[PDB]
Amino acid sequence: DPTQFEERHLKFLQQLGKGNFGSVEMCRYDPLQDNTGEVVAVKKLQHSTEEHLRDFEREIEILKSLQHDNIVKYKGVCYSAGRRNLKLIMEYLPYGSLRDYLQKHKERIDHIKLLQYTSQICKGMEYLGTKRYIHRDLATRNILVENENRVKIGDFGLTKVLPQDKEYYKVKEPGESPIFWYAPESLTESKFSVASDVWSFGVVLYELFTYIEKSKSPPAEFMRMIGNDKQGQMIVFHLIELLKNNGRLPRPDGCPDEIYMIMTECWNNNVNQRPSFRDLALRVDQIRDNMAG
């Protein structure tokens, strides 16, 4: 079984990312011990808990079930014992997250290139939606760069499977949520759907066009519009109010009108009036072709 990875043969090379409930490492899986093994990505939990383990087992199954060019490849699992600790083994994408890649190569990345990535996220997302999976955490930090011409959705920590009788999923936290990417209904009602993923995709489109400018980030922009003198529970309250009164993220500098319109349509307060991923890709591909030859 290739899907079974022996723990003693997984050489730690570097920590890549940390989460509230886990981490991602760069390892070399070297069974022959001759230093010819491939470098892989290893996601692991930080809290031993049964409720976080169950969520993680569900996440492993969601990823195992995904086969697309714009989705990070599942490679296998790593067990240690009977009740174990469990590790998810994925392919290593060398250019890091889309957030870090863009932040460093802003001079090299055209608008056409940004739109090629956008279309790839849309295609990956539409594929998710056919399996009735809700991502719930669409952001540039969660998109990986395989190469200069290809991005993949690279983390599924918050992904949920829709119940068979509903088109939304209601879910809590319990700690810190990525609020500045959340749809109003996710803020008020805790409702997650394909439509709230579209809302968040809008924020991703925003991120990409700001070229990750710290002063222009979604938390920074929203906090200015709210008042940086705001508490904690009040931050969600005021954010709900601003969104409700058609308060939105500004058009990023240099961003064309056609693209900001895509963003604003993704940001419709009316769940049902938001575009579909298929149409999103269609408009994006159309714009890419108008900008090119």
Ligand X SMILES: COc1cc(F)c(CC(=O)N2CCN(c3nc(Nc4cc(C)n[nH]4)c4cccn4n3)CC2)c(F)c1
CB 88 within 8 A of CB 21: no
Output 20 or 33, the one with its CB closest to ligand X. 20
- What binding mask, one character per residue, do residues 65-84 give for ligand X by CB under 6 A, x or -? -------x------------
- Binding residue positions for ATP: 16-24, 43
Residue type, 279: D
Q: What angle do CA 12, 16, 20 make, to 5 degrees?
A: 110
3-state secondary structure the chain: CCCECCHHHEEEEEEEEECCCEEEEEEEECCCCCCCCEEEEEEEECCCCHHHHHHHHHHHHHHHCCCCCCECCEEEEECCCCCCCCEEEEECCCCCEHHHHHHHHCCCCCHHHHHHHHHHHHHHHHHHHHCCEECCCCCHHHEEEEECCEEEECCCCCCEECCCCCCCEECCCCCCCCHHHCCHHHHHCCEECHHHHHHHHHHHHHHHHHCCCHHHCHHHHHHHHHCCCCCCHHHHHHHHHHHHCCCCCCCCCCCCHHHHHHHHHHCCCCHHHCCCHHHHHHHHHHHHHHHCC
**Smallest distance, ligand X to C-beta of residue 156, A:** 9
Output 122 or 212, the one with its CB closest to ligand X. 212
Q: How far apart are CA 17 and CA 7, in angstroms?
A: 20
- What binding mask, one character per residue, do residues 167-196 give for ligand X by CB under 6 A, x or -? ------------------------------
Q: How far apart are CA 238 and CA 174, in angstroms?
A: 20
- Counting contacts by CB under 6 A, is residue 28 touching ligand X? no
- Counting contacts by CB under 6 A, is residue 37 touching ligand X? no
Q: Which of 137, 155, 197, 229 is catalytic?
A: 137
- Counting contacts by CB under 6 A, is residue 59 touching ligand X? no
Output 165 or 173, the one with its CB closest to ligand X. 173
**Smallest distance, ligand X to C-beta of residue 120, A:** 16
**Smallest distance, ligand X to C-beta of residue 17, A:** 3
Stretch that binds ligand X, among 22-30, 191-199, 230-238, 281-289 (CB under 6 A): 22-30
Stretch that binds ligand X, among 57-65, 140-148, 243-251, 285-293 (CB under 6 A): 140-148
Active site residue 69: no
Which of 18, 106, 166, 244 binds ligand X (CB under 6 A)? It is: 18
- Counting contacts by CB under 6 A, is residue 16 touching ligand X? yes
- What binding mask, one character per residue, do residues 97-136 give for ligand X by CB under 6 A, x or -? x---------------------------------------
Whether cis (ω within 30° of 0) applies to the bond prior to 163 is no
- Counting contacts by CB under 6 A, is residue 10 touching ligand X? no
- Counting contacts by CB under 6 A, is residue 24 touching ligand X? yes
- Counting contacts by CB under 6 A, is residue 17 touching ligand X? yes
- Binding residue positions: 16-24, 43
Q: Give the residue numbers annotated as catalytic, written as ranges.
A: 137
Residues that bind ligand X (CB under 6 A): 16-19, 22-24, 41, 43, 72, 90, 92-94, 96-97, 141-142, 144, 154-155
